Design a protein around this nucleic acid. Structure first.
Lengths: 131, 31, 88, 228, 170
RNA sequence: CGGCCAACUACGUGCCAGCAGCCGCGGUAAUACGUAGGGUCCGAGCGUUGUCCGGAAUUACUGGGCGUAAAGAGCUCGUAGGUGGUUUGUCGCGUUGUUCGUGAAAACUCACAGCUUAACUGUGGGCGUGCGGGCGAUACGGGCAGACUAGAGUACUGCAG
RNA sequence: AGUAACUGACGCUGAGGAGCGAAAGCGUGGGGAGCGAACAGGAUUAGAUACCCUGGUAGUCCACGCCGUAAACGGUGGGUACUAGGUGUGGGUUUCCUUCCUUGGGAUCCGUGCCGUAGCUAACGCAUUAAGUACCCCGCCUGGGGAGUACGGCCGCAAGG
């Protein structure tokens, strides 16, 4: 069955990115929408929107490609997963690509990046890495 | 995979089975 | 398997209302009838292992449904167990 | 800035392609309709691409550059040959020797030998040796001139390559890609758009469509040589 | 001025009816020590000739390493064939820390301070290929900011910006 | 003092005597044996043996694998366990922030000071990755009380074997 | 497969455990045409405990039970989602060429082959039926022999596992 919706979202993104698709659709949830917001604000995707599906709602994500058809996402990894979950204190927040990437962290103040969490002095669950 | 490994294993197995056959009554009487 | 009239009668008897067929009560009752029929059949054909596997599958499904009904509401579980003459 | 109109190449049959079975899924961008089991190429993309191809050819030849005309399929042989002759540009029509562009230094010796044998013909040394040797020499002359028709003007390298039916001449496109020379091609519905830089969607199996495209490119290079 | 590193010479042989025919293959690294490197693999019947072909092939294929001052931009891991080489930037004055093939490639490329480890397929050719694959995975911060359409400060940590400032001042 | 691995010649011997961590060297012309010149590395030390860690990503949490290299149970059902779709409210168990107590000294690390320097000694921080008490947050996991139908199953109508 | 009437997460995996599990073999009772281990002659051969020929007993068959192994192989554990296409073939629903006769063609769901991208792999190759991209659970591997052997134990009438 489906165990990790977040990992499934990340793999849909990765598979669409590798195939140079301009569009990826998935079932909607608040967590997926929030990490989509973080991705868009960090400039990793072009834009996203939510339609309505036959049963629930869908998530529509536009992938960003450069003028020479070069992908704007180099990698997407799921860090904390069902089973072995990962939590980081405000001081040992992970660095992605030596700071060139973004680590999404679920803190009690919402979804933040590693730099935002470090600035606000909070910890939480390390959802994923983007670079 | 090469059949050489199967040949080594089969020769070991064949020799062991021959040994078991040769001492069936002796094993039965000692056990 | 059961004919349409047997299914209709069992569903009318054990169903929660006059339309439901997927309630755990109705499913468990139908499974119990099917299992009894299969047991009678296998009492004659002892070497029908292929049908016995289907019997095992039905038994497992009924056990899972009863587990769900017990977890949801114990009173319904007790009522169903006493009404259908089951042990566990 | 289109020399030909939207009816010109349509009449030739530019919208024709190949069967749906032998199509390339990467060409769904320029595919407009499938009819009678064959794919119909949208011509609007063809126009908005041939204008850019014309512009690139103009800026390349105007800045002291040359283009190389490639076509080997019998449908588009005489067309490219006559266009290259009438604009005085290199061309290949018989057969692409594997490695003209990559192995340029070696194949230039063939042109040197052809010139030497033309000089020998001019001096008249057909009787000074054995008849078998002179016969074999004449055969070598014919083979070298026949296989290298438009190659006698290769000084440095072709600054661009114009090719018909990239599937047929995959070696030439691969050589350009290895060297990095830009390639301008008319891609059919079974071709790969990832290998060409300046595609012009259309049919190549028709003599008339390929002829019309060669007319267009020849006009571009001719006017560019006019504006040196 | 070009520096060269002949990292390995191997005597290969093919069998014929008469016997064995031995040739030589040399893997050569060519760089300028300023950020560009090239890898060549030449083969000939004589060692100097094979070295010459390797040198010309390495010079033909050149590739620029995204250095930042004296080290690479960020940690990378490159894999080619079964060879795995990991690279990690180091503070100035650390020096090159790598095995022979990786050390040759990095010193040719002009990297001065880096932590490099080989994690599989000790074969020199494949280790060199993996090192080149890792070096080809590096991204300059300006290109990263361009990809995401953000200012250079919103993408990179302040330490990288300070390092770039000091390097360009020097 | 062949290569790993800084540092080579001569004489004696010849499948011997011997050397050797591995690869392997001794068959009258050995840079591998023995001895002398020369050299290199260390130096009141220098080598050998024994034991532990590293190299070893070679038990792989960081950080490995299972078509043919070692590695998918002959196949199912199912117990304990592990794990779990969308959504509302609540708890604050996990998670996270802060604060107080504790985490002896010594040791380690940073700075300073005293032995003529150093080893060594002292002083002041840090460390003591943890645990206990109070207070704050509720994104995620979990619990509790609900809701939904895309998973799962039932019903009905046909169908092939 | 269609309708989607019903229930409303009731799902997945599964240590141990239970069941099924080719052939040969074993027990009791029948049957026994053909084939046929063993066993007899004949031939070939230097020798034929074989290949070939003529015979031929267990067995092969049936009833009821044991055994529990196989190159029990796709040498590929199960569930789920995503990632170019082309072309055969099996089962079912449907729109349009419509003769509606016709693999007419399309669309769709479920199987089963071939060829082929991206990607993966040491290579061979795999490639929407993954050996690709990921998540959950289980089994297993840690140089070759000794050895799947000895010892002990459990199961089995025994063979043996």
């Amino acid at each position: 069955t489906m165990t990790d919706p977040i990992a499934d979202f990340l793999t849909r993104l990765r598979n669409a990115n590798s195939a140079y698709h301009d569009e990826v659709t998935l079932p909607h949830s608040k967590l997926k929408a929030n990490i989509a917001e973080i991705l868009k604000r960090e400039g990793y995707i072009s834009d996203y929107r939510t339609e309505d599906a036959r049963v629930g709602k869908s998530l529509v994500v536009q992938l960003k490609y450069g003028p020479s058809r070069e992908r704007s996402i180099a990698g997407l990894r799921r860090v904390s997963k069902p089973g072995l979950r990962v939590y980081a204190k405000s001081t040992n927040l992970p660095r992605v690509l030596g700071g060139l990437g973004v680590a999404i962290i679920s803190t009690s103040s919402g979804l933040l990046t590693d730099r935002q969490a470090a600035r606000q002095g909070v910890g939480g669950e390390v959802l994923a890495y983007v670079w | 995979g090469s059949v050489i490994k199967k040949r080594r294993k089969r020769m070991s197995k064949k020799k062991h089975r021959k040994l078991l056959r040769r001492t069936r009554v002796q094993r039965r009487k000692l056990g | 398997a059961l004919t349409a009239e047997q299914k209709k009668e069992i569903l009318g008897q054990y169903g929660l209302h006059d339309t439901d067929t997927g309630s755990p009560e109705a499913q468990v009752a139908l499974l119990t009838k099917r299992i009894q029929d299969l047991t009678e059949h296998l009492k004659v054909h002892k070497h029908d292992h292929h049908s016995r596997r289907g019997l095992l599958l039905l038994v497992g499904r009924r056990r899972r449904l009863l587990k769900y009904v017990a977890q949801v509401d114990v009173a319904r579980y007790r009522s169903l167990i006493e009404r259908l003459g089951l042990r566990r | 800035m289109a020399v030909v109109t939207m009816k010109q190449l349509l009449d030739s049959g530019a919208h024709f392609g190949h069967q749906t079975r032998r199509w390339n899924p990467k060409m769904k961008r320029f595919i407009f309709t499938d009819r009678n089991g064959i794919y119909i190429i949208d011509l609007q993309q063809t126009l908005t691409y041939i204008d850019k191809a014309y512009e690139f050819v103009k800026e390349t030849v105007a800045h002291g550059g040359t283009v190389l005309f490639v076509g080997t399929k019998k449908q588009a042989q005489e067309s490219i040959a006559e266009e290259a002759t009438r604009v005085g540009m290199p061309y290949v029509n018989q057969r692409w020797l594997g490695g003209m562009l990559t192995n340029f230094s070696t194949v230039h010796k063939r042109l040197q030998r052809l010139k030497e044998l033309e000089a020998m013909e001019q001096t008249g040394g057909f009787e000074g040796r054995t008849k078998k040797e002179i016969l074999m020499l004449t055969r070598e002359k014919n083979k070298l001139e026949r296989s290298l028709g438009g190659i006698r003007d290769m000084q440095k390298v072709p600054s661009a390559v114009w090719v018909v039916d990239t599937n047929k001449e995959h070696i030439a496109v691969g050589e350009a890609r290895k060297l990095g020379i830009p390639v301008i091609a008319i891609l059919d519905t079974n071709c790969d758009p990832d290998v060409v830089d300046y595609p012009i969607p259309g049919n190549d199996d028709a003599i008339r469509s390929a002829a019309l495209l060669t007319k267009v490119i020849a006009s571009a290079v001719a006017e560019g040589l006019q504006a040196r | 001025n070009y520096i060269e590193r002949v990292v390995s010479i191997n005597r290969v042989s093919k069998v014929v009816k008469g016997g064995r025919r031995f040739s030589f293959t040399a893997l050569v690294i060519v760089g300028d020590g300023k950020g560009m490197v090239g890898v060549g693999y030449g083969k000939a019947k004589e060692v100097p000739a094979a070295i010459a072909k390797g040198v010309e092939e390495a010079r033909k294929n050149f590739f620029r390493v995204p250095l930042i001052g004296s080290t690479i931009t960020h940690p990378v891991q490159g894999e080619a064939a079964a060879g795995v080489v990991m690279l990690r930037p180091a503070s100035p004055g650390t020096g090159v820390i790598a095995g022979g093939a990786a050390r040759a490639v990095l010193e040719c490329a002009g990297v001065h301070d880096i932590l490099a480890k080989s994690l599989g397929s000790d074969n020199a050719i494949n280790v060199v290929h993996a090192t080149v694959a890792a070096l080809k995975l590096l991204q300059r911060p300006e290109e990263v900011a361009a990809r995401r359409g953000l200012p250079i400060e919103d993408v990179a940590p302040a330490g990288m910006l300070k390092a770039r400032r000091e390097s360009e001042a020097l």
